[PDB]
Amino acid sequence: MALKRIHKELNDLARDPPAQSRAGPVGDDMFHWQATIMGPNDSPYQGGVFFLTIHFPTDYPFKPPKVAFTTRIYHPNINSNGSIKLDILRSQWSPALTISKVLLSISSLLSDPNPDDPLVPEIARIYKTDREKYNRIAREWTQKYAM
């Protein structure tokens, strides 16, 4: 069941790339994928290429995939271990969601952080009180780790 739906998504992702991202299986293993996502245009991550790892549970699509950044990034909702603060990855998951929709969601979150429910409280604080500094540091980290 999971395997069948997982090749289905592979085609759909190849034919219709979500938000300047690329994604596919780690060689033979269909339950482990690598992805890249581009920093959104006119975000401070612009120009960056960010690596993601994706692990599908055995009972996918009824349980969410595990999705994490492996590229360091400066963002209130993504922590130093690359965990991503998206409801759909945790409690709001539904089998009507897809990896394409997750990648779309990641892109939207990069463009518009949610500092009120952060994974990194101090970065959220900077985002709120000194956005110029947040943009500067986000850009610096993009230049250092993703470019």
Binding site: K85, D87, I88, R90, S91, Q92, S94, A96, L97, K101, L104, S105, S108, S111, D112, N114, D116, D117
Partner: protein, 76 residues
């Protein structure tokens, strides 16, 4: 004027609005039908997150436009 608001899971909400309605009014209308409080709604159109203080006309949102509703829940 009708617009459509789609959730990530593909649910379609249909709203009766005016071009002069503010994003904040739109969120209130979404609240009446879906129970989601405005503070936890994000509305996206043409790749941009919409701001509460602007109107649908400000963003050039026309009849039967599709807006995307993103939820950002507390404790999330």
């Amino acid at each position: 004027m009708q617009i459509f608001v789609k959730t990530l899971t593909g649910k379609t909400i249909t709203l009766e609005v005016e071009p002069s309605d503010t994003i904040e009014n739109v969120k209130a209308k979404i609240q009446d039908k879906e129970g989601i409080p405005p503070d936890q709604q994000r509305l996206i159109f043409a790749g941009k997150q919409l701001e509460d203080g602007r109107t649908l006309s400000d963003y050039n949102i026309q009849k039967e436009s599709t807006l995307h509703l993103v939820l950002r829940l507390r404790g999330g």
